[PDB]
Amino acid sequence: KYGINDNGTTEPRVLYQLDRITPTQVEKFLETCRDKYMRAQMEPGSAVGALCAQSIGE
């Protein structure tokens, strides 16, 4: 729509805060989405059917 990223300098400086995704964030985005995915695994030995019997029964 506007605001060319020719080197990251246009004359109105505010325009680069439209969709800011700066690469300190996107690497912290992956190290969080990895670790949130790794944490939310089924912990081994977790009475898996006993969770199922409550969650159908309740």
């Binding site: 004359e11 109105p12 400086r13 505010v14 325009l15 805060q17 439209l18 800011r20």
Partner: protein, 122 residues
Amino acid sequence: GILFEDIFDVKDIDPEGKKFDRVSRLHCESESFKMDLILDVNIQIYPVDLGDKFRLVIASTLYDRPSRADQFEYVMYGKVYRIERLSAYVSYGGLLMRLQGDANNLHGFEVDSRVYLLMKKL
């Protein structure tokens, strides 16, 4: 130190009907910049009426010992929290401000920064 200022004309004191007893949401229009803003104002302390020219100044700082910018007579304090012709959403605790339009003069703004209002009737 001023981020942004102009003279504004409040046109709808409350656009969709009075919802609160102490806060009414104004709709204004600038003078020759054409910055629409949608500002909430505590009207119990500072009553505003239809068609009232009032100044508006957005400042990052105010400079009782350092002798603050106090020529104005209604001062809030809040942070910008969204930039979406740019909109520029400012929140004042709960009181929203959606100063809009013409991104060349809006250049001083950013996100996550503390912002004062300094209003004054005319």
